[PDB]
Design a protein around this ligand. Structure first.
Ligand SMILES: [Mg+2]
Ligand SMILES: [Mg+2]
Ligand SMILES: [Mg+2]
Ligand SMILES: [Mg+2]
Ligand SMILES: [Mg+2]
Ligand SMILES: [Mg+2]
Ligand SMILES: [Mg+2]
Ligand SMILES: [Mg+2]
Lengths: 54, 84, 177, 136, 104
RNA sequence: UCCCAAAAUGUAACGGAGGCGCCCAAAGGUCACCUCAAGACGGUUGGAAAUCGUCUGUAGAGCGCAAAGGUAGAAGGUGGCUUGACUGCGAGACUGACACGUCGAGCAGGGAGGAAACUCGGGCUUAGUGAACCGGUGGUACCGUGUGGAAGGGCCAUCG
RNA sequence: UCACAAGGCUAAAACCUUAUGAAACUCCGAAGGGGCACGCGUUUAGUCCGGGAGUGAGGCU
C-alpha cells in the first residue's frame, strides 16, 4: 500500500498451530498497540486462533 | 492587442457509466442465477423467489417466470413462479 | 408511604366534589422526574461526582447522565458529553421523596409563601423546578462544596389545568397568596 | 431586479406561457405578445417610467421577475476555457403571460403609463381589464 | 411500540421458509397459541384456554402447549416455526415452548 | 455522484456543481432491544440553542466522508457473545473491443450468534485503485543436468 | 429544495389569503421508447464456423 502511512498498518496473522500459515490484514494501531487475537480457519487442520505476527 | 485568456476550468469531471435499470422485465422467463434487476437501493424489493446481493441486485433462486408488482405507488417487488 | 392512603383520602375528595363516573378516572401522578442539568459550561469530573452523590443520597436512586443532543452551538458545545443529569422517581419512591419534600423540604425553604400557581402544562399537568439547594433534609453544606439547584417536573393525568391545580393542592401543596 | 443567492448558470427553450394570465391586484393590466427574455434594467425601466407618470403614486404590480443568469464570454477570446461569467439577469416572459398590473389610477393613466412602458420593450403588447376569473 | 410484534412477524419470512407459523398471545391471562400456513389465509391448530383452563395461570403454559402440540400431532402437522409478537421468550411462553418443543 | 442525456442501457464538449487514493478490531457476524428533526407551553445553572417535562410529530432527521437512489416492520440509536473481514468451489447471469470488473443460489470441511426457523465467505450500495516483469518473505518437496544430495527454479501464499 | 410578486400578522422567523420561476425541484405525468411472448398475417432476412479485406478526417438540411 502507501508506504509512509503509520495508522492502519498492514500486518499478517500467523497461526499458533505452526502449520506454516498466515492471514493478512490491517489494525489501526490507534487501538491494539500490543498485538491481535483472532479465530480463523486453517486448511492444514480445522480452526487455530492466530497471533498478529511481526 | 489579442487575447491571453487566461482562465482554466475546475470541472469537466464525470464517472464511467453504471448500467443500472431493470435488466429482466415483467412476463419473460428466467433461469436460476439469472439477474433480473440492478439498482442503487431498494427501488425494487425482493419478492417471493428472488434474492438480493450486496448491490441490492435481484437474482433468481430457481427457474420459471417473472412477476412484477407495484403496491399502489412507491413499494414494489418482483417474484418468480414456475411453468405449472 | 402513608401518602398512599392520602391519595386515597383524595380519591373521593374529588369523586364527591366533582361528579365523576369512576375512581380510576381521577388524576393520578405518574413519576416526579428530577433534572440535575449543570452543563452548557460546567465540564468537571468533580461536579458530576457531586451531582451523583447528591442525587443518589437525596432520592436514594442512581442518576442517568443525559448527554449533548449533538447540539454544538457557537459557544462551548459538542456531541458526546454530560449536559444534564436525570433521575425518574415513580410510584413508591416518588411518594417517599415527595413526602421528603412537603415534610422536610417546603418549610426549610428560605423565603417561602408557596409556589407558582399560574397555569402550567396547558394539558393540565405540572412542572416546577426551583433554584436553591440550601433548603434540604439531605443536601448538606457539611457534605457538599458550593451551591447548586434542582429542576423537577411532576406528571398528572388531569384533563385540564384546574383539575391538576386542585389535585396537587389537596395533596399537600402551597400555592402562594 | 437581481436576486439574492442561487445556482449560477443556465440554458434556453420556448413554447407558450404557463400562468398567470389573469388580472389580480389591479383593475388594469398589460400583457406580452412575444416569447421574449427580459432584463433587470429592462423592467426597472418601466418601474421608473410608469412611476413617473402616476405621480404620488398609484399602485404598481410588476408581475414579472428576472431569475435567469445570461452570460457573455470575455470579449475577444476564442471559445473554450469556460462558460461566460454572469453578464446579466432575465425574466423569460412568454406570450399571453401578463407582466404589469396597475390600478389606483384611471383608464387614461393605464393606457398612457402602459404605452410609455411598452415603448421600452422588445415586444408588441396589449393592455386590458379583468374578467379572467378562474381564481382572483 | 407495535414495532416488536411486526418485527418478529416479518422475521417469520411469511411462507417462503416452507414451514408453519406458531402464534401466541401471553399478554393477558387468556392466551391463544395458533397454527398457520400463513400463505393460505387459514388456521390449522387451536389450543385456547377460555373454555376452562385448569386453574393455573402461567403454569398453564406447558399445558395449552401440550394441548396444542397434541392437536397438531393429530392433524399431521409435524413441523414448527415459532411466531410471537411482543414477547421475550423466557418464562411463560418459553414453557409453552419446551412442552411444545417435545409435546406433539 | 449529479444534471446535460431527447421518460429503456448508452452518448461529446477546455459544458454546468462536487467528491476519492481512506476509514472501521467495532463502524463487521449473530442475538436482543430502543426511534427521529424540529415547533408550542412550562420549567435551577440556562433562559436564541443547553438539561428535564408534556401535546404535536412518516421522515421537516439519521447513515464516518460526495451527492443520488435508498431507508422507520431499519440500513438509523444501545448492549450480549463474537472472528464468516474463512479455506476448497462455483449453478447461472449483469458488464466490457480485449483484458477487467459486478452480483450469486447451492456443496463440502469447519465454525459464530439464536432456544429456534435461521443468518454470515466484510460494512445501505455505487469512489477509496496499478496488468506483466524483475526481486523480498512464509510454506511446499514438482524440477535439479552420470547418480544421490544442496544452489537455483516451480506451485500456494504474500510484501515492493 | 433554492428562488421570488403583493398583502396579512406578530416580535421579523413561522403561518394565512393572493402569486410564480427552475438543467442539477418533483403530489402528479403522456406521446413515444425498450425487453419478453405470440405470429393470430405479411415479408424476406437472420445466426454460426473458416478465408480476404478496407474503413478508423466526415459533410449539409
Ligand atoms: Mg432515449
Ligand atoms: Mg460519440
Ligand atoms: Mg520488461
Ligand atoms: Mg522461496
Ligand atoms: Mg530450495
Ligand atoms: Mg389530487
Ligand atoms: Mg485515429
Ligand atoms: Mg460526427
Amino acid at each position: 500500500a502507501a508506504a509512509g502511512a503509520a495508522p492502519r498498518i498492514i500486518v499478517k496473522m500467523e497461526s499458533s498451530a505452526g502449520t506454516g500459515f498466515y492471514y493478512t490484514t490491517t489494525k489501526n494501531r490507534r487501538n491494539t498497540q500490543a498485538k491481535l487475537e483472532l479465530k480463523k480457519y486453517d486448511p492444514v487442520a480445522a480452526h487455530v486462533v492466530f497471533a498478529a505476527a511481526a | 492587442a489579442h487575447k491571453k485568456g487566461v482562465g482554466s476550468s475546475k470541472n469537466g469531471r464525470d464517472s464511467n457509466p453504471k448500467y443500472l435499470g431493470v435488466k429482466k422485465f415483467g412476463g419473460e422467463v428466467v433461469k436460476a442465477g439469472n439477474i433480473l434487476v440492478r439498482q442503487r437501493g431498494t427501488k425494487f424489493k425482493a419478492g417471493q423467489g428472488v434474492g438480493m446481493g450486496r448491490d441490492h441486485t435481484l437474482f433468481a433462486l430457481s427457474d420459471g417466470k417473472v412477476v412484477f408488482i407495484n403496491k399502489g405507488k412507491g413499494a414494489r417487488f418482483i417474484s418468480i413462479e414456475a411453468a405449472q | 408511604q402513608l401518602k398512599t392512603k392520602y391519595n386515597d383520602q383524595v380519591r373521593p375528595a374529588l369523586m364527591q366534589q366533582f361528579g365523576y363516573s369512576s375512581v380510576m378516572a381521577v388524576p393520578r401522578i405518574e413519576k416526579i422526574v428530577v433534572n440535575e442539568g449543570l452543563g452548557s459550561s460546567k465540564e468537571d469530573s468533580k461536579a458530576i461526582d457531586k451531582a451523583a452523590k447528591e442525587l443518589a443520597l437525596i432520592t436514594l436512586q442512581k442518576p442517568i447522565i443525559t448527554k449533548a443532543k449533538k447540539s454544538i452551538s457557537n459557544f462551548k458545545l459538542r456531541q458526546g458529553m454530560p449536559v444534564g443529569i436525570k433521575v425518574t422517581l415513580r410510584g413508591e419512591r416518588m411518594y417517599v421523596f415527595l413526602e421528603k419534600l412537603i415534610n422536610i423540604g417546603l418549610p426549610r425553604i428560605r423565603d417561602f409563601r408557596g409556589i407558582n400557581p399560574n397555569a402550567f402544562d396547558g394539558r393540565g399537568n405540572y412542572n416546577l423546578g426551583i433554584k436553591e439547594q440550601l433548603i434540604f433534609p439531605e443536601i448538606t453544606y457539611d457534605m457538599v462544596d458550593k451551591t447548586r439547584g434542582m429542576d423537577i417536573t411532576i406528571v398528572t393525568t388531569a384533563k385540564t389545568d384546574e383539575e391538576a391545580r386542585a389535585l396537587l393542592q389537596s395533596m399537600g401543596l402551597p400555592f402562594r397568596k | 431586479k437581481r436576486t439574492k443567492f442561487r445556482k449560477q448558470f443556465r440554458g434556453r427553450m420556448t413554447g407558450d406561457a404557463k400562468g398567470g394570465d389573469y388580472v389580480a391586484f389591479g383593475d388594469y393590466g398589460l400583457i406580452a405578445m412575444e416569447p421574449a427574455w427580459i432584463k433587470s434594467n429592462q423592467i426597472e425601466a418601466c418601474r421608473i417610467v410608469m412611476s413617473r407618470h402616476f405621480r404620488r403614486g398609484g399602485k404598481i404590480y410588476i408581475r414579472i421577475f428576472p431569475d435567469k443568469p445570461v452570460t457573455k464570454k470575455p470579449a475577444e477570446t476564442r471559445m473554450g476555457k469556460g462558460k461566460g461569467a454572469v453578464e446579466y439577469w432575465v425574466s423569460v416572459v412568454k406570450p399571453g403571460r401578463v407582466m404589469f398590473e396597475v390600478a389606483g389610477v384611471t383608464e387614461e393613466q393605464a393606457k398612457e403609463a402602459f404605452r410609455l412602458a411598452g415603448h421600452k420593450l422588445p415586444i408588441q403588447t396589449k393592455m386590458v381589464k379583468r374578467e379572467v376569473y378562474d381564481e382572483a | 411500540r407495535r414495532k416488536l410484534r411486526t418485527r418478529r412477524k416479518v422475521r417469520t419470512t411469511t411462507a417462503a421458509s416452507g414451514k408453519l407459523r406458531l402464534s401466541v398471545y401471553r399478554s393477558s391471562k387468556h392466551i391463544y397459541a395458533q397454527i398457520i400456513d400463513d400463505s393460505r389465509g387459514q388456521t390449522l391448530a387451536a389450543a385456547s384456554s377460555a373454555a376452562l383452563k385448569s386453574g393455573n395461570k402461567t403454569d398453564t403454559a406447558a399445558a395449552v402447549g401440550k394441548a396444542l402440540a397434541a392437536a397438531a400431532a393429530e392433524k399431521g402437522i409435524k413441523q414448527v416455526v415459532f411466531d410471537r409478537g411482543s414477547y421475550k421468550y423466557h418464562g411463560r411462553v418459553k414453557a409453552l415452548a419446551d412442552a411444545a418443543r417435545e409435546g406433539g
